[PDB]
Structures are given as C-alpha cells and as structure tokens.
Amino acid sequence: TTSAVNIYNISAGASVDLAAPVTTGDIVTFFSSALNLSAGAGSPNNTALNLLSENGAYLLHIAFRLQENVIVFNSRQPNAPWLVEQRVSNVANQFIGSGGKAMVTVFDHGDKYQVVINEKTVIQYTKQISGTTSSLSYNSTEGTSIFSTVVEAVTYTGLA
Amino acid sequence: TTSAVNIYNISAGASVDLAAPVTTGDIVTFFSSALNLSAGAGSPNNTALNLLSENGAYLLHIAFRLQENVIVFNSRQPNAPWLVEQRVSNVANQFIGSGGKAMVTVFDHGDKYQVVINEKTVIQYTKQISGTTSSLSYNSTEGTSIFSTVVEAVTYTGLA
Numbered sequence: 001t002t003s004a005v006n007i008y009n010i011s012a013g014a015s016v017d018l019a020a021p022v023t024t025g026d027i028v029t030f031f032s033s034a035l036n037l038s039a040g041a042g043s044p045n046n047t048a049l050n051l052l053s054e055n056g057a058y059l060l061h062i063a064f065r066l067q068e069n070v071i072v073f074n075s076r077q078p079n080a081p082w083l084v085e086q087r088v089s090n091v092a093n094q095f096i097g098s099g100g101k102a103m104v105t106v107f108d109h110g111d112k113y114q115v116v117i118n119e120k121t122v123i124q125y126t127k128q129i130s131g132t133t134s135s136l137s138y139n140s141t142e143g144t145s146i147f148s149t150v151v152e153a154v155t156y157t158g159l160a
Numbered sequence: 161t162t163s164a165v166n167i168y169n170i171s172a173g174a175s176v177d178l179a180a181p182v183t184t185g186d187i188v189t190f191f192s193s194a195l196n197l198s199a200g201a202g203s204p205n206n207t208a209l210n211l212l213s214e215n216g217a218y219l220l221h222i223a224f225r226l227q228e229n230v231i232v233f234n235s236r237q238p239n240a241p242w243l244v245e246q247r248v249s250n251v252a253n254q255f256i257g258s259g260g261k262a263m264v265t266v267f268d269h270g271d272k273y274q275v276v277i278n279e280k281t282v283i284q285y286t287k288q289i290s291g292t293t294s295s296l297s298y299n300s301t302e303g304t305s306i307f308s309t310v311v312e313a314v315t316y317t318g319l320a
C-alpha cells in the first residue's frame with residue numbers, strides 16, 4: 001500500500017511532463033510565494049494554470065483576470081476551439097486567507113475537478129473532457145502575474 | 161465527494177488543532193522554507209513532527225537527530241513511555257537534491273503511516289497507536305532545528 005509525492009518547479013511560460021500521472025482520486029496543488037492582486041491588467045490572463053493530457057489538450061485551464069474581475073475555467077481539445085467557459089466573480093475575494101502567498105489545489109474527482117484556493121472551494125467543475133493529466137503548465141502576461149515567477153506544483157498520486 | 165484543504169502555521173514549540181481530523185485515506189504535508197543540515201546537536205531531537213489524537217496519543221512522532229545521524233519514528237500514549245523506536249540511518253541522504261527547503265508528507269494508510277521526505281519514501285510505519293489524527297506539533301531544540309522557524313502544514317481530508 002503506497003501512494004507517491006512528486007515536486008515540480010514551473011516557471012511562468014513553461015510546461016512540465018509529469019513523472020507520475022494524475023487520475024481520479026489524486027491531488028495537484030500549485031504553490032505561489034507571492035500574491036499581487038493589485039497587479040494590473042492581463043491580456044486577458046494575469047495568470048493561467050493548466051492541466052494538460054497526453055496529446056496537449058486542456059483538461060483544465062484556470063485563468064485569473066483582474067481587469068475583468070473573474071476566474072475563468074474551461075477545457076479544450078488540441079487545436080480545437082475553447083469549449084464552454086465557466087466564471088466565478090471577485091478574484092481578490094477568493095484569496096482572503098494568506099497575503100503575500102497562495103495555493104491552488106485541483107482534486108481530480110473523475111467526472112469533475114474540485115478547485116480549491118487556499119482553504120476555499122471556488123468551483124466544482126464538471127468535466128468537459130475525460131483523461132489523465134500528463135502535463136501541467138503555468139502562463140502569465142509579463143509584469144502582471146498575480147503569482148510568483150516560479151510556482152511549485154506538488155502532485156499526490158497512487159491515491160486510488 | 162468533496163475534499164477539504166486546511167492550512168496551518170506552526171512555530172517551533174507549538175501545537176495545532178485540526179478543524180478537519182486526518183483519518184485513513186488523508187494526508188498531511190509539512191513545508192519548511194529552510195533546510196539547516198548543520199544546525200546540531202539536538203537534545204536529542206534537532207526537529208520533531210507529531211501527529212496526535214484528542215486524548216493526546218503520539219500516533220506518529222518523527223524526530224530528526226543530526227548528531228546520532230538518524231530519523232526516529234515512534235509513538236506514545238498520554239503521560240506514558242515511548243513504544244518500539246524505528247530508526248532510519250543517515251539524515252542528509254533522506255534529502256537528496258533538496259536544496260534550501262523541504263517537505264515531509266505523511267499518508268494515513270490505515271495499517272501504516274507512509275512517510276515521504278520531498279519525493280523519497282523513508283519508511284512505511286506500522287501503527288503502534290491507532291485511529292484518526294486530530295492534532296499536529298513542531299518541536300525543535302534550541303536554535304538547532306533543521307527546518308525553518310515556522311513550518312506550514314497542509315492537510316488534505318475527505319479523500320476515500
């Protein structure tokens with residue numbers, strides 16, 4: 001009876017293939033050592049965190065938009081259009097926990113993803129696409145990330 | 161099928177009560193923003209991390225001893241003596257390519273606690289005192305702790 005922990009640094013703009021895969025029952029948390037909710041204007045995304053499947057599809061895209069004051073979730077296929085957007089308003093509100101740092105956890109629930117920011121569940125995203133996560137990525141628009149330039153992802157796998 | 165993330169700030173010498181007790185299937189991770197592998201000696205423990213009950217049984221005690229150069233895993237009842245110690249030899253070899261921070265993960269697997277330093281499992285530990293983890297502490301000697309002044313503890317609960 002053995003689960004695993006895996007630890008990745010992700011620079012803004014970079015992707016990472018996962019040493020182990022995230023499937024149902026598993027957890028991935030993105031840790032940022034800074035929080036800039038006065039950061040300015042994304043075009044449109046201040047920061048996006050992404051779970052990507054084997055072929056470069058987005059199972060989950062989490063995008064913080066200060067100037068639109070929303071957090072935007074979505075999925076898509078590789079080279080195909082962005083699917084049905086979901087939104088949660090007030091960005092700065094979901095972060096009242098820690099100043100100067102934050103964490104974003106994605107609980108893979110099989111049919112959904114629970115997304116928790118620090119201690120607060122911000123969406124129970126019903127999946128638009130099924131599949132194993134093999135890749136995580138972090139983007140920003142330069143000069144306006146709400147998060148550090150490096151984000152530490154930790155994965156807890158072997159859970160099921 | 162909804163999970164909880166709880167975050168806790170533990171200073172050396174302190175104890176914290178979990179708003180969501182840890183049980184079979186659950187996870188604690190302790191995050192040190194420091195790694196001082198030349199801080200010793202301890203008395204004997206440079207650093208200790210503890211998973212307790214409401215009745216205050218040490219369900220899992222993890223002590224780091226630089227001088228004896230060992231990680232001790234033990235448990236004890238409230239106001240009683242320690243049980244059968246388990247010892248892992250060679251402290252810095254448990255932190256291979258750690259750098260200037262560390263994390264320690266405990267999995268509650270029911271029969272055994274699975275302890276992982278960063279990405280390396282260090283022990284599968286046959287429970288000597290059973291049940292759910294209801295509390296956490298961080299103990300250090302003098303200023304000889306191998307971790308940072310404050311450790312951040314993240315619990316993942318409601319997993320199975």
Ligand SMILES: OC[C@H]1O[C@@H](O[C@H]2[C@H](O)[C@@H](O)[C@H](O)O[C@@H]2CO)[C@H](O)[C@@H](O)[C@H]1O
Pocket residue numbers: 044045061063072073074082085
């Ligand atoms: O859906 C996430 C996706 O949005 C793109 O921007 C959209 C915008 O959200 C939509 O309402 C607008 O009308 O058109 C834009 C282009 O699809 C982002 O550019 C993309 O990166 C994701 O963040």
Ligand SMILES: OC[C@H]1O[C@@H](O[C@H]2[C@H](O)[C@@H](O)[C@H](O)O[C@@H]2CO)[C@H](O)[C@@H](O)[C@H]1O
Pocket residue numbers: 203204205221223232234242245
């Ligand atoms: O065993 C957990 C507990 O150990 C104590 O030290 C032990 C020690 O490992 C053994 O060699 C010793 O001489 O008997 C001791 C029990 O008194 C530490 O004092 C303690 O803080 C814990 O880590």
